[PDB]
């Protein structure tokens, strides 16, 4: 009745979702085969298993998610893995051939055959539930499947549903390193059909998560399973107030209105505070007044940016565990006085706090310790504009003499989308630049 729904598009969407749904079944009691843990019996009321699961007649909790991807390979690994009994096989749908890093295949010629089936699958998920509150789009900006097919899922869902909120999670193409070559093409063309068709889009860089694992954790050599656990920790803490009792719960509905000022600036960053290895957790005194001080500092960010060069508009802080409401209030008091960190001068409050009573649990195999307290920061920052400007420059290097274009335009694709995306992206930068100064 206070539930949400998620759809994962692309290989990154389902591989992150593999790490998320491990944590969702450890927070709530549900065993890997979609069952209550036996023995230990939580009873009837206790309605925390609703935001991400659906209860059948027996104790078979089925997750409220459809995993669509055009490749079979990663979906079949999920379907033959340790969670084959959890996901309903009609939710584990798959395509035929991938879009293969091609936006045209993900939107026009290969993405149009599953689009009827994925909307039918979301509609009966939406019909079965009654209290819909938001959508959780898990994908990546890099590939052609995960960014091209979600463009349909951002637009068809907006036309069919409309007023209901819908949240987006994505993987930013990395600033210094990159995975593939055609990534700057797939990154900005989706923004034309993402800007006016979304409410907020949490943007995450994987290269900064590498830097987190190197320094904040003691683990050099990170595997993708270790990277997506941090994203699973973030997506659990945004939706922690929708399922769990807290002193100051925040609903997903008022989460938008206290984060996004304007209907076009809807790109917040992410920050998880207590990313500490178990040994160093045995050492450090960890407290509220310094754990959100670690949120603001540039070396604990999730996207390559700079808080010292970028001014925040609105900050949404979400706490967990043994938090007490002055401990945030003393922490906001001591950080308003910090002359290193700058806000924009027309927003004097600039803060939303979120208080939750139950501390996070740690999945076995990870590096985090069982810390009784956690902070998730979700901040709109002007410094995302300079992360956009480098990606616009990466696109202009290829597009100067029109390279890697015949793969696109041969598959039912035009060149007007290339032209219009430049001043569309220029409209992003001029909207993010006009808030940089205050009127005296």
């Amino acid at each position: 009745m206070r539930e949400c729904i998620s759809v994962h598009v692309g290989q990154a969407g389902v591989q992150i979702g593999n790490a998320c749904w491990e944590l969702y079944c450890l927070e709530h009691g549900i065993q890997p085969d979609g069952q209550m843990p036996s023995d230990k019996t939580i009873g009837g009321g206790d309605d925390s298993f609703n935001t991400f699961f659906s209860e059948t007649g027996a104790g078979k909790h089925v997750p409220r998610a459809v995993f669509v991807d055009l490749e079979p390979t990663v979906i079949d690994e999920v379907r033959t893995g340790t969670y084959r009994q959890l996901f309903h096989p009609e939710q584990l749908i798959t395509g035929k051939e991938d879009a293969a890093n091609n936006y045209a295949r993900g939107h026009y010629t290969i993405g149009k055959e599953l689009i009827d089936l994925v909307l039918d699958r979301i509609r009966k998920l939406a019909d079965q539930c009654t209290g819909l509150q938001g959508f959780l789009i898990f994908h990546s900006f890099g590939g052609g499947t995960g960014s091209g097919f979600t463009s349909l899922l951002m637009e068809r869902l907006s036309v069919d549903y409309g007023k209901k909120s819908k949240l987006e999670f994505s993987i930013y193409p990395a600033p210094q390193v990159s995975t593939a070559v055609v990534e700057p093409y797939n990154s900005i063309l989706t923004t034309h059909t993402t800007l006016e068709h979304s409410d907020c889009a949490f943007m995450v860089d994987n290269e900064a998560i590498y830097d987190i694992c190197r320094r904040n954790l003691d683990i050099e050599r990170p595997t993708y399973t270790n990277l997506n656990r941090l994203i699973g920790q973030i997506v659990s803490s945004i939706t922690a107030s929708l399922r769990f009792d807290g002193a100051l719960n925040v609903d997903l509905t008022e989460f938008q209105t206290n984060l996004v000022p304007y209907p076009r600036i809807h790109f917040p960053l992410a920050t998880y505070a207590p990313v500490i290895s178990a040994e160093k957790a045995y050492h450090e005194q960890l407290s509220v007044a310094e754990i959100t001080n670690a949120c603001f500092e540039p070396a604990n960010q999730m996207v390559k940016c700079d808080p010292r060069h970028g001014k925040y508009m609105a900050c949404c802080l979400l706490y967990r565990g043994d938090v007490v409401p002055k401990d945030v209030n003393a922490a906001i008091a001591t950080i308003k006085t910090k002359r290193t960190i700058q806000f924009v001068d027309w927003c004097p409050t600039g803060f939303k706090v979120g208080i939750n009573y139950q501390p996070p649990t740690v999945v076995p195999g990870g590096d985090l310790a069982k810390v009784q307290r956690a902070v998730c920061m979700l901040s709109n920052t002007t410094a995302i504009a300079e992360a956009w400007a480098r990606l616009d420059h990466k696109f202009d290097l290829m597009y100067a003499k029109r390279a890697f274009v015949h793969w696109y335009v041969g598959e039912g694709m035009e060149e007007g989308e290339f032209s219009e995306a430049r001043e569309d992206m220029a409209a992003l930068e001029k909207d993010y630049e006009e808030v940089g100064m205050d009127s005296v």
């Binding site: 079979p72 079949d76 379907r79 033959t80 096989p89």
Partner: peptide, 26 residues
């Protein structure tokens, strides 16, 4: 075995009347 089509389905499969539950002895 080989993952082509419907192999989901292959691998996965390889005394009361209304009176006696409402009108019981009081």
């Amino acid at each position: 075995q080989c993952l082509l089509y419907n192999w989901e389905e292959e691998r996965a499969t390889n005394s009361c009347t209304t009176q006696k539950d409402s009108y019981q002895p009081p």
